[PDB]
Amino acid sequence: SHSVTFFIGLFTGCFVALLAGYIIVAHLTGMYRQHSANTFYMETAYPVLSMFGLLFLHLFLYGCNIFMWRKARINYSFIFELGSKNELKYRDVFLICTASMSAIAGVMFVHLSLLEKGYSFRQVQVIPGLLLLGFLLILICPLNIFYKSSRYRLISVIRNIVFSPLYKVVMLDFFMADQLCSQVPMLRNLEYIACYYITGSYATQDYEYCMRVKYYRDLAYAVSFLPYYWRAMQCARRWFDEGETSHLVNLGKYVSAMLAAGTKVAYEKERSLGWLCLVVAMSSVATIYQLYWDFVKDWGLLQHNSNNPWLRNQLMLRQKSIYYFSMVLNLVLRLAWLQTVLHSSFEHVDYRVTGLFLAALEVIRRGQWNFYRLENEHLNNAGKFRAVKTVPLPF
């Protein structure tokens, strides 16, 4: 109502002022760009702010999509089979992303402040891991507190995602399985906060315990490409349930961007020109094989014989130049995707503040992908996830 607009802007300005306070106190206290002797800043506290700054950028873009789907008269509640009974509105989503990230920036500004003065060096290196465990417990908080039946709708989907070929596929565990494919640099910022606090690297402050042995270096990379494995096994399930041959062509899309990741690991052990050809060809095969599926099969555009040139026959936006801007913005932004599915940020140094800017551009590319995907479920039925083409009017 009238008070929700206040608290959205209250936690927005609290988030921004806490970051400008955090950046300035980082700029002048040695820990700006690894100037100080305490080198643990850009490896033990920076993955905690990189994992939460990409998880609440994706949740913010889902709140922007609800605003877009309701103005363009997309019946996204009927398409997602959400129905009724306290719909998550876009003002409710913006309230989550700003109140949570102000709490993360509050504790992370405490942590950057409360170590120069001293204060229990063995115990203060638990407050980054305490912030992640606090939000892990909030997501499984069962009472009635933080949007019950919307947090347990989420874990009911991720249960169907991780156990991928065991469960049937609908358009909610297909939709959320593609949101995980843009969070591949985020899941590498979670296999270090599951190795610094479970293997005793925070007791004597052992710094490079995980990256020193290379049995946790390719295993931090082969387990990084799990969302491309979970989504490829879902296409292997719709080919079992249904009998369309397009699911096998869809299956090859996610395996093509696993072979491109696989050739580079073979290139990093036999560095020469012979593996340099296969790392620029398989990474260019996989790029054109996902740009083909985004424009033709997902968005439903590039129809050869149509009234609108290079688009489909029936359009939903009246300004028909937004489609041409989105077909070029998605083409450019599938190049920051090839620098997250190939090279991580923990293997080479000094490309860490630009390795998060390329990681935050694949989250925005899944922001404009959600709008034209459901638009191709209303003016078409592309996924045949529901069999009647007629969609009723939204409430």
XYZ file of C-alpha atoms in Angstrom:
395
model
C 0.000 0.000 0.000
C 1.187 3.508 0.872
C 3.801 2.295 3.381
C 5.411 -0.362 1.158
C 6.726 2.389 -1.146
C 8.435 4.017 1.852
C 10.235 0.892 3.080
C 11.361 -0.031 -0.442
C 13.068 3.354 -0.700
C 14.247 3.224 2.914
C 16.217 0.017 2.384
C 17.339 1.189 -1.068
C 19.168 4.261 0.218
C 20.446 2.294 3.198
C 21.909 -0.233 0.741
C 23.607 2.434 -1.390
C 25.031 4.446 1.522
C 26.383 1.279 3.151
C 28.208 0.400 -0.079
C 29.721 3.878 -0.474
C 30.747 3.643 3.166
C 32.191 0.183 2.502
C 34.102 1.261 -0.620
C 35.641 4.343 1.036
C 36.763 2.455 4.152
C 38.259 -0.165 1.814
C 39.961 2.544 -0.272
C 41.968 4.039 2.607
C 42.667 1.087 4.913
C 45.156 -0.929 2.861
C 42.648 -3.480 1.533
C 41.656 -1.574 -1.626
C 43.351 -3.598 -4.400
C 45.513 -5.958 -2.277
C 47.931 -3.229 -1.174
C 48.167 -4.436 2.440
C 49.941 -7.417 3.984
C 46.531 -8.842 4.966
C 45.911 -10.504 1.601
C 42.759 -12.281 2.837
C 40.399 -9.525 1.626
C 39.966 -10.364 -2.072
C 39.683 -14.109 -1.362
C 37.805 -14.621 1.939
C 35.486 -11.579 2.168
C 35.065 -10.741 -1.541
C 33.426 -14.128 -2.445
C 30.812 -13.467 0.269
C 29.788 -10.172 -1.338
C 30.110 -11.607 -4.856
C 27.769 -14.516 -4.107
C 25.093 -12.291 -2.551
C 25.452 -9.468 -5.073
C 24.599 -11.895 -7.874
C 21.824 -13.744 -6.015
C 19.889 -10.548 -5.220
C 20.528 -9.079 -8.655
C 18.703 -12.056 -10.173
C 15.859 -11.783 -7.657
C 15.537 -8.070 -8.459
C 15.280 -8.874 -12.167
C 12.491 -11.357 -11.461
C 10.599 -8.530 -9.773
C 11.127 -6.419 -12.880
C 9.721 -9.284 -14.963
C 6.466 -9.453 -12.967
C 6.070 -5.730 -13.670
C 6.722 -6.369 -17.371
C 4.417 -9.399 -17.640
C 1.487 -7.563 -16.032
C 1.746 -4.424 -18.184
C 1.980 -6.473 -21.397
C -1.059 -8.571 -20.285
C 0.900 -11.832 -20.092
C -0.994 -14.388 -17.999
C 2.183 -15.556 -16.282
C 0.201 -16.962 -13.347
C -1.651 -19.370 -15.640
C 1.510 -20.162 -17.620
C 3.591 -20.929 -14.508
C 0.528 -22.690 -12.967
C 0.719 -20.433 -9.908
C -3.025 -19.794 -9.770
C -4.208 -17.784 -6.781
C -3.826 -17.578 -2.947
C -1.476 -14.611 -2.164
C 0.512 -13.967 -5.349
C 4.015 -12.582 -4.892
C 3.675 -9.041 -6.244
C 6.582 -7.076 -7.669
C 6.535 -4.653 -4.731
C 6.976 -7.660 -2.441
C 9.995 -8.786 -4.474
C 11.665 -5.350 -4.385
C 11.174 -5.307 -0.606
C 13.102 -8.581 -0.279
C 16.122 -7.573 -2.384
C 16.656 -4.218 -0.656
C 16.069 -5.298 2.954
C 18.310 -8.361 2.601
C 21.198 -6.665 0.807
C 21.246 -3.840 3.366
C 21.680 -6.499 6.061
C 24.484 -8.125 4.053
C 26.169 -4.755 3.502
C 25.678 -3.964 7.189
C 27.485 -7.073 8.440
C 30.168 -6.769 5.741
C 30.805 -3.156 6.794
C 31.048 -4.377 10.390
C 33.556 -7.036 9.279
C 35.725 -4.555 7.366
C 35.652 -2.275 10.415
C 35.965 -4.816 13.247
C 39.331 -6.334 12.342
C 41.779 -3.397 12.256
C 41.065 -2.711 15.928
C 41.675 -6.385 16.761
C 38.716 -8.235 18.311
C 39.308 -12.005 18.277
C 41.112 -12.832 15.017
C 40.115 -16.510 15.256
C 36.471 -15.612 15.973
C 36.009 -12.643 13.619
C 36.727 -14.935 10.621
C 33.410 -16.682 11.234
C 31.134 -13.656 10.515
C 31.447 -14.080 6.703
C 30.306 -17.691 7.031
C 27.721 -16.664 9.623
C 26.008 -14.383 7.099
C 25.586 -17.200 4.566
C 24.295 -19.608 7.220
C 21.832 -16.952 8.375
C 20.252 -16.688 4.928
C 20.379 -20.464 4.496
C 18.299 -20.787 7.672
C 15.908 -18.033 6.528
C 15.165 -19.972 3.327
C 14.178 -23.001 5.433
C 12.534 -20.941 8.201
C 9.227 -22.839 8.529
C 7.053 -20.736 10.820
C 5.132 -18.116 8.811
C 7.656 -15.352 8.595
C 9.412 -14.540 5.316
C 6.799 -15.297 2.628
C 5.666 -18.806 3.491
C 4.415 -20.805 0.456
C 6.826 -18.730 -1.652
C 10.064 -19.919 -0.049
C 8.757 -23.499 0.040
C 7.592 -23.174 -3.553
C 11.248 -22.476 -4.366
C 12.749 -25.524 -2.621
C 9.994 -27.669 -4.161
C 11.401 -26.608 -7.550
C 15.105 -27.097 -6.724
C 14.237 -30.602 -5.500
C 13.030 -31.347 -9.039
C 16.077 -29.622 -10.561
C 18.947 -31.398 -8.780
C 17.227 -34.786 -9.139
C 16.843 -33.953 -12.815
C 15.723 -37.058 -14.816
C 13.719 -38.494 -11.901
C 10.931 -35.887 -12.002
C 8.611 -34.712 -14.754
C 9.228 -31.294 -16.301
C 6.689 -28.460 -16.169
C 7.268 -24.767 -16.886
C 8.398 -23.922 -13.352
C 11.315 -26.338 -12.931
C 12.246 -25.592 -16.540
C 12.164 -21.838 -15.915
C 14.201 -21.968 -12.700
C 16.641 -24.471 -14.228
C 17.638 -21.828 -16.786
C 18.075 -19.195 -14.074
C 20.807 -21.405 -12.606
C 22.637 -21.472 -15.956
C 23.454 -17.755 -15.604
C 24.675 -18.255 -12.012
C 27.688 -20.427 -12.928
C 30.214 -17.805 -11.639
C 28.066 -17.607 -8.490
C 28.444 -21.346 -7.790
C 32.219 -20.915 -7.913
C 31.728 -18.273 -5.201
C 30.044 -20.994 -3.145
C 32.604 -23.822 -3.424
C 35.058 -21.631 -1.534
C 32.558 -20.794 1.239
C 32.045 -24.550 1.355
C 35.801 -25.208 1.599
C 37.080 -22.421 3.894
C 34.551 -23.229 6.648
C 34.164 -27.026 6.503
C 37.790 -28.157 6.120
C 39.273 -26.271 9.067
C 40.662 -23.359 7.046
C 39.262 -20.866 9.592
C 40.859 -22.303 12.760
C 44.548 -21.531 12.180
C 43.464 -19.262 9.264
C 44.824 -21.593 6.589
C 44.443 -19.475 3.452
C 45.007 -21.496 0.263
C 44.114 -24.964 1.463
C 41.688 -25.718 -1.379
C 43.442 -24.198 -4.404
C 46.879 -25.577 -3.459
C 45.902 -29.157 -4.265
C 44.624 -29.406 -7.840
C 42.170 -32.150 -6.842
C 40.002 -29.222 -5.659
C 40.762 -27.079 -8.721
C 39.176 -29.064 -11.551
C 36.668 -30.418 -9.025
C 35.868 -26.762 -8.361
C 35.321 -26.496 -12.130
C 33.595 -29.757 -13.102
C 31.092 -29.287 -10.256
C 30.730 -25.661 -11.399
C 28.952 -26.872 -14.564
C 26.105 -28.610 -12.764
C 23.292 -26.271 -14.029
C 24.192 -27.265 -17.587
C 24.024 -30.918 -16.524
C 20.717 -30.496 -14.671
C 19.127 -28.734 -17.645
C 20.457 -31.240 -20.200
C 18.953 -34.117 -18.207
C 15.558 -32.389 -18.267
C 15.615 -32.426 -22.074
C 16.465 -36.144 -21.788
C 13.271 -36.513 -19.740
C 10.870 -34.707 -22.096
C 12.229 -36.900 -24.891
C 11.167 -39.864 -22.746
C 7.746 -38.452 -21.826
C 6.918 -36.814 -25.165
C 8.236 -37.886 -28.538
C 9.376 -34.681 -30.215
C 12.827 -34.718 -31.791
C 13.418 -31.072 -30.820
C 14.241 -32.092 -27.240
C 17.310 -33.958 -28.511
C 18.350 -30.812 -30.380
C 17.664 -28.978 -27.115
C 19.757 -31.609 -25.315
C 22.724 -30.865 -27.565
C 22.637 -27.178 -26.619
C 23.736 -27.724 -23.012
C 26.218 -30.486 -23.871
C 27.833 -28.186 -26.460
C 28.626 -25.725 -23.674
C 30.161 -28.503 -21.588
C 32.517 -29.715 -24.293
C 33.693 -26.122 -24.755
C 34.434 -26.043 -21.029
C 35.962 -29.521 -21.276
C 38.455 -28.686 -24.026
C 39.930 -25.800 -22.021
C 40.792 -28.064 -19.074
C 42.609 -30.274 -21.577
C 44.180 -27.112 -23.005
C 45.458 -25.959 -19.587
C 47.487 -29.192 -19.236
C 48.883 -29.414 -22.805
C 49.245 -25.681 -23.615
C 50.004 -25.398 -27.347
C 48.368 -24.479 -30.647
C 46.701 -27.874 -31.141
C 44.388 -27.375 -28.168
C 44.125 -23.650 -28.947
C 42.242 -24.452 -32.154
C 39.785 -26.710 -30.314
C 39.222 -24.113 -27.561
C 38.221 -21.393 -30.063
C 36.119 -23.655 -32.321
C 34.087 -25.519 -29.685
C 33.579 -22.201 -27.867
C 32.297 -20.741 -31.148
C 30.138 -23.768 -31.952
C 28.548 -23.485 -28.500
C 28.002 -19.742 -28.897
C 26.102 -19.999 -32.184
C 24.187 -23.056 -30.919
C 22.796 -21.113 -27.943
C 22.173 -17.917 -29.910
C 20.142 -20.007 -32.355
C 17.982 -21.449 -29.575
C 17.453 -18.063 -27.908
C 16.135 -16.294 -31.008
C 14.288 -19.041 -32.901
C 13.094 -21.602 -30.355
C 12.847 -19.673 -27.069
C 11.743 -16.193 -28.147
C 9.935 -17.418 -31.264
C 11.447 -14.732 -33.491
C 13.333 -14.964 -36.837
C 10.298 -16.377 -38.649
C 11.256 -16.520 -42.328
C 7.794 -15.973 -43.864
C 6.029 -13.421 -41.668
C 4.264 -10.076 -41.873
C 6.770 -8.483 -39.506
C 10.273 -8.921 -41.000
C 12.687 -11.025 -38.872
C 10.070 -11.361 -36.088
C 6.975 -13.517 -35.676
C 3.497 -12.783 -37.038
C 1.739 -11.737 -33.815
C 3.546 -9.233 -31.594
C 2.533 -8.122 -28.116
C 4.595 -4.948 -27.667
C 3.341 -2.046 -29.763
C 6.763 -0.424 -30.202
C 8.301 -3.005 -32.548
C 11.863 -1.698 -32.225
C 12.308 -3.141 -28.722
C 12.514 -6.592 -30.341
C 15.359 -5.415 -32.584
C 17.211 -3.895 -29.629
C 16.778 -7.104 -27.619
C 17.969 -9.287 -30.517
C 21.221 -7.284 -30.592
C 21.669 -6.864 -26.820
C 21.335 -10.637 -26.411
C 23.898 -11.104 -29.203
C 26.493 -8.908 -27.475
C 25.744 -10.271 -23.997
C 26.516 -13.819 -25.148
C 30.188 -12.840 -24.962
C 30.331 -12.100 -21.243
C 28.771 -15.569 -20.987
C 31.798 -17.111 -22.737
C 34.157 -15.523 -20.187
C 32.299 -17.135 -17.274
C 31.853 -20.590 -18.821
C 35.527 -20.687 -19.757
C 37.758 -18.863 -17.289
C 37.076 -18.416 -13.577
C 38.280 -15.612 -11.311
C 40.367 -17.746 -8.919
C 42.876 -19.003 -11.505
C 44.232 -15.670 -12.793
C 44.800 -12.617 -10.624
C 43.875 -8.884 -10.932
C 40.821 -9.509 -13.129
C 38.492 -9.721 -10.137
C 36.502 -6.464 -10.223
C 35.964 -6.984 -13.958
C 35.243 -10.681 -13.448
C 32.192 -9.632 -11.444
C 31.090 -7.098 -14.062
C 31.123 -9.851 -16.687
C 29.368 -12.104 -14.166
C 26.652 -9.474 -13.621
C 26.003 -9.090 -17.358
C 24.887 -12.710 -17.780
C 22.348 -12.107 -14.994
C 20.881 -9.191 -17.001
C 20.850 -11.394 -20.114
C 18.607 -13.805 -18.195
C 16.586 -10.718 -17.270
C 15.452 -9.944 -20.810
C 15.270 -13.644 -21.678
C 12.417 -14.214 -19.218
C 10.144 -11.656 -20.876
C 10.234 -12.946 -24.451
C 10.095 -16.569 -23.277
C 6.676 -16.190 -21.650
C 5.530 -13.886 -24.451
C 6.101 -16.899 -26.717
C 3.914 -18.925 -24.330
C 0.945 -16.533 -24.630
C 0.951 -15.663 -28.357
C 2.116 -19.180 -29.228
C 2.694 -22.356 -27.172
C 6.366 -22.895 -27.330
C 7.159 -25.732 -24.997
C 3.955 -27.496 -25.376
C 4.150 -27.570 -21.570
C 0.320 -27.135 -21.617
C -1.584 -28.280 -24.591
C -4.450 -25.790 -25.091
C -3.219 -22.738 -27.005
C -5.899 -20.375 -25.652
C -4.948 -18.540 -22.451
C -7.590 -16.762 -20.323
C -7.349 -13.118 -19.347
C -5.334 -12.264 -16.203
C -7.181 -11.359 -13.011
